[PDB]
């Protein structure tokens, strides 16, 4: 009966744990001992984007590493010119309650969605000049928390109904749906190869998926609280997650376990965003303590503090070329570090 | 600066629009609806006329109200309640026909982001509770309570029980009783909002 199935599941979980422990020959910090530290990584506020009036919730860099799109609960989505600090597009939204935004790698479309259970798609290159709504991805049950782009057609979204979904912008239908989580899926990160993507969910576990087949490949445990943000390592062979337990963890796809956990007794705030550098040496992770720290990804040691915000940071993402490190926070100010 | 001057011109021309839109939108009084399932929030929001957030807005006595009914978000409220940190007042409803909403009230009033917001409590379904008390004693829903069994005292006792969950002096629970058949809700909301506006404005200037 169901007891036999439960016993089989327990045996399978024990086998998975034994296999994962078998491959743990040594810790990451054991191997990375003989590498010289990065020293002080202090950065200064080179630019400041003083254009918002309410809390800023997301900021995604453009493909050319010069245009930044910021989504705020003031009811506007603004595309920032990071060099001249000018505003190039002010997009009035439908529902002011937004929680994520995305810049397409082609630089044509901008996706913004939130508590309205709709992941809107905006067209920047309209021949009429003004930005218009090209599609409204209705169909979700819970709130949409993270949207990312594969191309100008296929957009992957994560919501609070424990399900992620691959959409087709040209048709407005859920081409593929993903299930297996038991809580609100809050974060998403498409891999550089655009064939895999991991999702962070409020079940304190991170799950990997395949975009084409649509079947979950692996699962990762260890977090004691909900995962608030996640991102791939630039090499595509690892990913780091930031949970509300004031810890940042590093997981390897080919190891199926946790590599290093970034923690400090001083910090107890809730991590809200993580992002690597171009070379994978620095993991700039946000915090709820009004300051964004900088973590040496290999030595698991702090390198500097990016303080300067009057409130908690909500997003921190580096550019494609790795020249700047943008931040966004609840104080309606976006600061560009370097 | 060949044509970048025109870029700066456009940037200023839309920064002005952002500032004007924000100033215009600051005139609205944000309100948040809350309560249990079938707890009478729908009828009170329908009395003023006009599955994500269902926003209802109405203008009453030169004030523009915005009501946010979040009953459609059947998810973990911990991850999205902070979006309403700037709400002027929380409108919380409890049906007296059924104790089940006490935990929800405690969670809302003890929440970190709502330590300075005034929870306008409503007690709807007055006549149903009265008829239930007239038929059966009010002690059925409150086994601990063994006081006088009358509607006029049971209502006061339940109001005291709900108000006992407050833990801060900066917020005042403007209780009220409704029977889902009177248009007195608007006046109570208006009076409470005026009081909260006065309190917040005085606190901002340091006089409070």
């Amino acid at each position, epitope marked *: 009966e169901l007891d036999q199935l439960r016993q089989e599941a327990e045996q399978l979980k024990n086998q998975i744990r034994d296999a994962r422990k078998a491959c743990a020959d040594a810790t990451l910090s054991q191997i990375t001992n003989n590498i010289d530290p990065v020293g002080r990584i202090q950065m200064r506020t080179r630019r400041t984007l003083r254009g918002h009036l309410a809390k800023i919730y997301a900021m995604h860099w453009g493909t050319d590493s010069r245009l930044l799109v910021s989504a705020s609960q003031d009811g506007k989505l603004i595309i920032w010119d990071s060099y001249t600090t000018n505003k*190039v*597009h002010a997009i009035p939204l439908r529902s002011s309650w937004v929680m994520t935004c995305a810049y397409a790698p082609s*630089g044509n479309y901008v996706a913004c969605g939130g508590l309205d259970n709709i992941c809107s798609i905006y067209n920047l290159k309209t021949r*009429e000049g003004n930005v218009r709504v090209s599609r409204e991805l209705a169909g979700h049950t819970g709130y949409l928390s993270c949207c990312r782009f594969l191309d100008d057609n296929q957009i992957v979204t994560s919501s609070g109904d424990t399900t992620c979904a691959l959409w087709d912008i040209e048709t407005g239908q859920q081409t593929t749906t993903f299930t297996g989580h038991t809580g609100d899926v809050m974060s998403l990160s498409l891999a550089p190869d655009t064939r895999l993507f991991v999702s962070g969910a409020c079940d304190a576990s991170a799950k990997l998926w395949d975009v084409r087949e649509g079947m979950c490949r692996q699962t990762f445990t260890g977090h004691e609280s909900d995962i608030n943000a996640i991102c791939f390592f630039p090499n595509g062979n690892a990913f780091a997650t930031g949970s509300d337990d004031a810890t940042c963890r590093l997981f390897d796809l080919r190891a199926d376990q946790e590599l290093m956990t970034y923690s400090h007794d001083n910090i107890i705030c809730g991590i809200t965003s993580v992002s690597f550098s171009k070379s994978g040496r620095l993991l700039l992770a946000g915090y709820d303590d009004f300051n964004c720290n900088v973590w040496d990804a290999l030595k698991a040691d702090r390198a500097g503090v990016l303080a300067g915000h009057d409130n908690r940071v909500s997003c921190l993402g580096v550019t494609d070329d790795g020249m700047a490190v943008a931040t966004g926070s609840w104080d309606s100010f976006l600061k560009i570090w370097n | 600066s*060949a044509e970048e001057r*025109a870029a700066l*011109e*456009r940037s200023k*021309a839309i920064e002005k629009n952002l500032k004007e839109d924000g100033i215009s939108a600051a005139k609205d009084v944000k309100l948040l609806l809350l309560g249990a399932d079938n707890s009478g929030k729908s009828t009170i929001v329908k009395q003023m006329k006009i599955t994500g957030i269902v926003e209802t807005h109405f203008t009453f006595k030169n004030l523009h109200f915005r009501l946010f009914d979040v009953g459609g978000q059947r998810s973990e409220r911990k991850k999205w309640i902070h979006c309403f940190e700037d709400v002027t007042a929380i409108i919380f409803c409890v049906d007296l026909s059924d104790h089940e909403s006490l935990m929800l009230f405690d969670s809302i009033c003890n929440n970190k982001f709502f330590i300075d917001t005034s929870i306008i409590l409503f007690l709807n379904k007055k006549d149903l509770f009265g008829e239930k008390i007239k038929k059966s004693p009010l002690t059925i829903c409150f086994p601990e309570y063994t006081g006088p069994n009358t509607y006029e005292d049971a209502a006061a006792y339940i109001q005291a029980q709900f108000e006992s969950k407050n833990r801060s002096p900066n917020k005042e629970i403007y209780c009220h009783m409704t029977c889902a058949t009177d248009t007195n809700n608007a006046q109570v909301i208006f009076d409470a909002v005026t009081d909260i506006i006065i309190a917040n404005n005085l606190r901002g200037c340091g006089l409070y």
Partner: single-chain antibody
Amino acid sequence: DVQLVESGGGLVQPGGSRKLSCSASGFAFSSFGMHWVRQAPEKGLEWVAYISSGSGTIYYADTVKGRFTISKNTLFLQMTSLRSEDTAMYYCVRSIYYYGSSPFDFWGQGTTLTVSGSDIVMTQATSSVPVTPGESVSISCRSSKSLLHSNGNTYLYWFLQRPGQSPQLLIYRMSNLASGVPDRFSGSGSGTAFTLTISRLEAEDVGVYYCMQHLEYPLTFGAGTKLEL
């Protein structure tokens, strides 16, 4: 579709006044900065005026300022004190300026009007290049100053004017290609010398080619190369 129709031109006695107007539809004209470009009956294009979005900054050409005034969805060029040298065909042109924008990306049908100093001069080496279909062609244009600004954007624009039609943009900022133009066209250069390259020249791509810069006002055009069949 996008349409820029205009009227008000015609024959007028010298010394009078006339009000040529441009009508805009199909796009958010309120966020667009309309220009005004004219071409003599037997010469090349000549920049005339410019008004920005929101009526912010208004410019005029050296031989224009004083008698021309530029001011829903309608652009006005109120004109007075008309002399015999003013006769030309005036084109209504739109443009928006932001990062990666496409200025001068659309031209109106034009109107016909007849009368009874330190500028960056631009000249073209050849004014006539015979060519046959299927063979690559090339047009050249040179300036009097380097167009390469400090930020690296060489404000050199290329325009194509098929006979009996309004000009259509082909290359903007000397390296980018507009929308709707086939990938056969190309533009390249360095500082002062510009070359427009066409590979596998189709018959429909016949017409005169005009060269423009946008580094400073007035926007002096070139003499125009008539790539003829």
